Amino acid sequence: MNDETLTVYRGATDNKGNPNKQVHGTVKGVFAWGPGTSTNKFGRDRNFKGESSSLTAELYVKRGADLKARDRIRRANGEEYSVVGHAAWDQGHPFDGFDFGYMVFQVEAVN
Amino acid sequence: MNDETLTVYRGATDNKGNPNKQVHGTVKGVFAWGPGTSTNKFGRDRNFKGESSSLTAELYVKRGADLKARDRIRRANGEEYSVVGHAAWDQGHPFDGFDFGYMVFQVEAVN
Amino acid sequence: AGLATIDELQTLMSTVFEDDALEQAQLVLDIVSSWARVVSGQMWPDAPANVPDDVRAVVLQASRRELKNPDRVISRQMGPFNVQYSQPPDGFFYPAELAILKRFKRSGGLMTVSTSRGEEGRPWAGKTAYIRYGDGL
Amino acid sequence: AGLATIDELQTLMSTVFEDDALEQAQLVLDIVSSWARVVSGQMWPDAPANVPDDVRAVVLQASRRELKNPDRVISRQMGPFNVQYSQPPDGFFYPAELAILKRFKRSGGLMTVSTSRGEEGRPWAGKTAYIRYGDGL
């Protein structure tokens, strides 16, 4: 498939709140900017003295990939995303057991 | 079917608010992350000093299963959910009486 | 006396029948074996011993179809999960499986029925009024 | 005695069958091999040794189809994922694969059944009442 290399940052926030994030490695996934024939809308805080926008998208990645929740991913374009929640549809087909081979990750744009 | 073993925790909150939850047993059910061709979106409190996310999903389980409301379920993946509300469509078809054999539970991610 | 053992069915289906699921599977196997015996015309005395490999394959496939899809659904949709099965066989076997089972018939499946006009036939008539004149040998 | 080894199937499917998935794959291979032996009419004594390349290809393709799609679905949907398959073969092999297997039959598949009218036949009749007069040689 086409895919896209990303840079994962895995770490655990300690009791005091210090983010200890370091380059865990790489992962290949396909970005989806909408659930269908439309695109998600960028949002703004309206109380921030800046021009930062918020976007929530999806990342279709192969099942069993080295990506987890709270794992920041940076594309070659420079955009950075935060993986929110666990993987979705990381299961076989209930009727048969067929493995579609891909699981969708919800990613929130953080830049 | 493919199914999935879950660990149920049944208990009753007393008048003083002390949760008394113990391992009731196991149940097999299929997790649905959306009502159709889409996925439910994770949410955040935005007032909690942490990185906890909220999620509501469904758990298709066979009719007559040993699962009730306010019955926490833990998957083999370590994810924990709280069953909210009673079972839905735990009834025969009105026209015929046909039993599809499955009832859907609403589960809210608690981790 | 099923044409295929329950162990072969379990291996093919990658399951292990337990309690009530075992008697149902055995009944389905016996039913499919009866269908195969009638269609092929060969009553195998030792059902699991001398049964041919292709007959075992056909019986196993038919039994798996009957166990997994007994009510012969075309589609099934539960929430976000859907499945669309192809057209089920007319009885238990698809035309190819019926051809496999019918391979034990001779003359390519051609059968002839002998007809009669209802007349008995007396070839000895005419020779009845016969008197032996001579030495006699 | 399958017509293709499990290693070739693993290479074609780019997987490694383990634990119970190996016995199921071996059973599927044996079933497909029996079907191919019946259809082609050639009972290969040394199944993995002298089996032709195209027969191995047909067996491998049929085994992969049976393992990946045993229940012969046309569509599958799980959330945002979906897949639509083509019409499955009537039995195990598509018509092209059946033609490949049937290439071992002679006369282009033409078979003749000899008929009879039920009469035995006595060519020696008429010559029975023969007496030898002469020298005798």
Next chain:
Amino acid sequence: AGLATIDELQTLMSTVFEDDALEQAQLVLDIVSSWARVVSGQMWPDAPANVPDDVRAVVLQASRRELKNPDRVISRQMGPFNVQYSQPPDGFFYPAELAILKRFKRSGGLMTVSTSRGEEGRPWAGKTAYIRYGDGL
């Protein structure tokens, strides 16, 4: 002994096969080569050397079809992405590709089977009872 080298397939697909992808691609190429050898009727001794260009083209196209779409889907959907494919070929080659391969058979594909009535034939009969009278030359 594939009819086309793996390097040609890599160039056509604009990819590089590594580790298990290489063995699967080689097996697919060998399978397609065996099918082409059977269909065309020509067993090329040196498979990559004297193979014709059109045969290589057909083999490469069929191998790419088998590698990219092994399960023969018509449509697959994943979120906002969807693709629909044309009807897959019956076996490995489309009718035009089958015609290209069948170009090595003479007489435009016409074949004749000679029949016999089962009679041996003795042309020397009648000449057997011959006695030579004369000088003898």
Next chain:
Amino acid sequence: AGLATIDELQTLMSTVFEDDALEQAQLVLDIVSSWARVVSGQMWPDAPANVPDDVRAVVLQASRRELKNPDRVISRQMGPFNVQYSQPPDGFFYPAELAILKRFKRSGGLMTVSTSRGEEGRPWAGKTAYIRYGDGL
């Protein structure tokens, strides 16, 4: 030895082929050229020099179709973008393109296969037993 140069293909597609894409385009051009040579029956010795204009056009169109749509899709959708293509050609060329390529065949494509009854033929028979009486000229 493609029937059309890569520069003509680049001009037609309004693109410039780079590494890992120039080799693929050249391979596609060679494949289409081999197919055109087989269909037309004319093996052009100097492929880019004396090739006719319409043959170059057919090769260029087929190569563009193969490069832009290698997997022969009917539809493709990604988010708010969709495209629906016509039915792909059976092989490489549409029937009009096949007719254009076949224009080099004579007698409107009519071909005759000479048959024989298997008999050798001895026209000199009868004249063998001939003795020359006379002067001799």
Next chain:
Amino acid sequence: VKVATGIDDLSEDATPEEQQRAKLILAQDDILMHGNHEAKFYTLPETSLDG
């Protein structure tokens, strides 16, 4: 020549030697039958021999 198409092939179980020609009885009274409804039975004409 009596011709049959669409009959159940693969029969006679890999047709052997040692007789095995049951020689299906087709007399004047017999009615030839086949279970398949797609099967077709017909004959090919013969040469006149008068020419």
Next chain:
Amino acid sequence: VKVATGIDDLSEDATPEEQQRAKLILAQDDILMHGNHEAKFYTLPETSLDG
């Protein structure tokens, strides 16, 4: 001329030399059969020779 169409081609396994002509027995009693139901058997007429 007896003509057969739709038969299983690719047969005889790359038809060799050294006899290999089994010479399918087609006598007066034989019934010619083919498994494929799309196969067609027919004959091409012959010249009259009277003219």
